[PDB]
Amino acid sequence: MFDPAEKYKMDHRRRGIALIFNHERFFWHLTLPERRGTCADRDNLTRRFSDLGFEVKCFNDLKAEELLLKIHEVSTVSHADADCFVCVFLSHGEGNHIYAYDAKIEIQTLTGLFKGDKCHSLVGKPKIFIIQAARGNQTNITEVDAASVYTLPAGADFLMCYSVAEGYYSHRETVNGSWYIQDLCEMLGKYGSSLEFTELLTLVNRKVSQRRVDFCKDPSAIGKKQVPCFASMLTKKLHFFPKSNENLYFQ
Amino acid sequence: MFDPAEKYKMDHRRRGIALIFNHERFFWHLTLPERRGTCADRDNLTRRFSDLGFEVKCFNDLKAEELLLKIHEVSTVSHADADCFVCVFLSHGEGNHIYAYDAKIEIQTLTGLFKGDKCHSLVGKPKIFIIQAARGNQTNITEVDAASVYTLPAGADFLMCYSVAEGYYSHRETVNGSWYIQDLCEMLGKYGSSLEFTELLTLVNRKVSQRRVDFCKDPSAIGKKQVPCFASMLTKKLHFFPKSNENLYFQ
Numbered sequence: 361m362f363d364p365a366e367k368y369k370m371d372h373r374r375r376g377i378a379l380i381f382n383h384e385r386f387f388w389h390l391t392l393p394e395r396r397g398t399c400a401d402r403d404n405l406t407r408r409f410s411d412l413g414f415e416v417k418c419f420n421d422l423k424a425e426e427l428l429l430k431i432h433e434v435s436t437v438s439h440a441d442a443d444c445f446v447c448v449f450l451s452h453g454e455g456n457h458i459y460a461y462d463a464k465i466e467i468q469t470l471t472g473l474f475k476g477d478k479c480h481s482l483v484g485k486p487k488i489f490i491i492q493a494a495r496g497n498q499t500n501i502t503e504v505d506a507a508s509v510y511t512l513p514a515g516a517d518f519l520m521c522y523s524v525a526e527g528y529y530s531h532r533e534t535v536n537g538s539w540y541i542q543d544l545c546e547m548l549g550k551y552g553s554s555l556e557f558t559e560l561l562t563l564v565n566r567k568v569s570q571r572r573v574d575f576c577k578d579p580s581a582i583g584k585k586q587v588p589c590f591a592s593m594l595t596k597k598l599h600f601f602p603k604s605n606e607n608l609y610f611q
Numbered sequence: 612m613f614d615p616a617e618k619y620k621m622d623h624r625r626r627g628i629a630l631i632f633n634h635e636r637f638f639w640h641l642t643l644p645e646r647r648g649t650c651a652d653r654d655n656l657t658r659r660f661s662d663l664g665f666e667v668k669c670f671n672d673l674k675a676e677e678l679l680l681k682i683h684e685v686s687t688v689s690h691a692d693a694d695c696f697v698c699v700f701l702s703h704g705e706g707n708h709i710y711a712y713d714a715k716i717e718i719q720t721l722t723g724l725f726k727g728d729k730c731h732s733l734v735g736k737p738k739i740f741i742i743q744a745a746r747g748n749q750t751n752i753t754e755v756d757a758a759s760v761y762t763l764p765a766g767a768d769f770l771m772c773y774s775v776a777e778g779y780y781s782h783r784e785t786v787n788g789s790w791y792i793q794d795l796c797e798m799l800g801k802y803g804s805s806l807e808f809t810e811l812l813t814l815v816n817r818k819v820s821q822r823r824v825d826f827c828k829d830p831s832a833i834g835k836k837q838v839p840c841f842a843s844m845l846t847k848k849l850h851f852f853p854k855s856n857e858n859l860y861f862q
């Protein structure tokens with residue numbers, strides 16, 4: 361009885377945790393610029409994921425040790441009564457690495473903690489990473505960084521979501537925030553609770569790709585297009601239909 | 612007039628070309644094993660893509676020069692009257708590279724030929740690469756290779772499809788062919804003409820991930836799971852609905 365329209369079971373007591381690691385400033389001796397606007401991204405994400413039933417937990421400018429402890433903590437707690445897990449990185453990156461305040465961390469070792477073997481309570485549930493990271497170039501200006509972070513897959517039932525692909529450029533407005541996150545959050549608002557999540561990510565691909573980069577206040581930022589992507593190792597359709605929270609304990 | 616259910620326009624005169632580069636043997640001084648079964652993959656793909664309206668063009672054991680000429684030829688011909696383009700690689704690979712008969716070729720330079728700038732007749736149309744490549748390990752046996760090929764994105768309106776992700780293993784039956792292709796072709800048969808293509812690729816992720824690797828005739832092949840993935844830079848829903856070929860010239 362194989363079913364072409366099979367959906368992840370999204371009828372657990374709680375939706376699950378959304379981690380947001382939010383990096384604005386960095387240790388001097390890394391020579392990485394401030395990410396003015398990242399707080400807009402953090403607040404906009406916090407709102408949109410809250411309205412889909414997520415317990416949102418943000419962390420600002422953690423050092424590598426603090427970050428690994430927080431994410432390892434979340435990996436070893438039980439998700440048995442949760443639909444899924446979301447983890448978001450708003451920082452700089454290079455290749456396999458995201459930047460904490462003080463050093464780079466290997467993306468594989470963060471996704472590794474939620475692989476079937478290591479986190480039994482999430483086996484067969486979606487694990488979604490969203491990554492707004494690129495190379496630190498060094499009122500509301502638009503700053504532009506080169507793509508730097510490999511569009512890695514992870515394991516079964518992971519969905520890796522990337523602001524920007526190889527050869528393209530990632531944009532951050534210093535008040536309104538990152539183009540990717542603005543359009544992700546807009547689509548979550550309008551369509552989170554109806555559309556299959558990859559159909560939604562495809563709309564974000566259209567929205568960001570269609571943003572015009574022909575008439576810019578900085579000449580050198582012209583023709584620097586932005587195309588995001590996602591790498592899906594998902595095995596079923598993924599929906600965030602409103603949960604039935606009437607006369608039930610969801611804490 | 613922004614539309615959450617927007618579809619690629621798939622109402623051109625012809626569907627388009629499906630290239631299949633099929634590699635069974637290799638130059639001695641590469642020390643890569645025969646890929647016994649690859650011909651089953653080629654024939655099964657040829658059939659399934661034909662039934663979706665593709666002009667299928669296969670090429671066996673091309674040297675690097677012959678391959679680059681054939682794919683460059685196809686890039687510079689007009690696709691103006693075509694829905695889309697498909698290109699399939701059945702070979703060995705490593706990192707950014709696929710193997711021709713005699714040497715490795717950079718995947719980026721093959722996808723590069725169909726980027727908007729370089730191939731005007733395919734701009735805003737889906738460009739779909741399918742890659743059944745892994746590391747040459749060195750009646751119907753199941754041979755098993757380690758994942759080796761980076762799950763790269765390309766540019767806007769590309770869909771990169773990979774047999775296997777980092778840390779997993781790719782399987783080929785020597786008569787029935789590659790697990791990935793068997794399940795891709797089965798799903799194309801049942802659902803090609805109805806399902807959105809990424810929904811279908813997700814079914815292939817389930818089918819291949821669910822294949823059991825616990826009781827194997829070779830002991831050392833046990834616990835070697837296979838998870839494929841796709842990297843979507845698509846901007847719209849993609850369907851291969853049957854084309855209206857009644858009283859119309861489609862050659």
Ligand SMILES: Oc1cc(F)ccc1CNc1ncccc1-c1ncon1
Pocket residue numbers: 507508509510511512513525526527761762763764
């Ligand atoms: O997406 C990219 C973004 C860039 F800025 C540069 C290069 C790539 C494409 N490369 C990869 N894509 C997927 C998984 C792994 C890799 C990879 N590359 C080297 O080692 N592993």
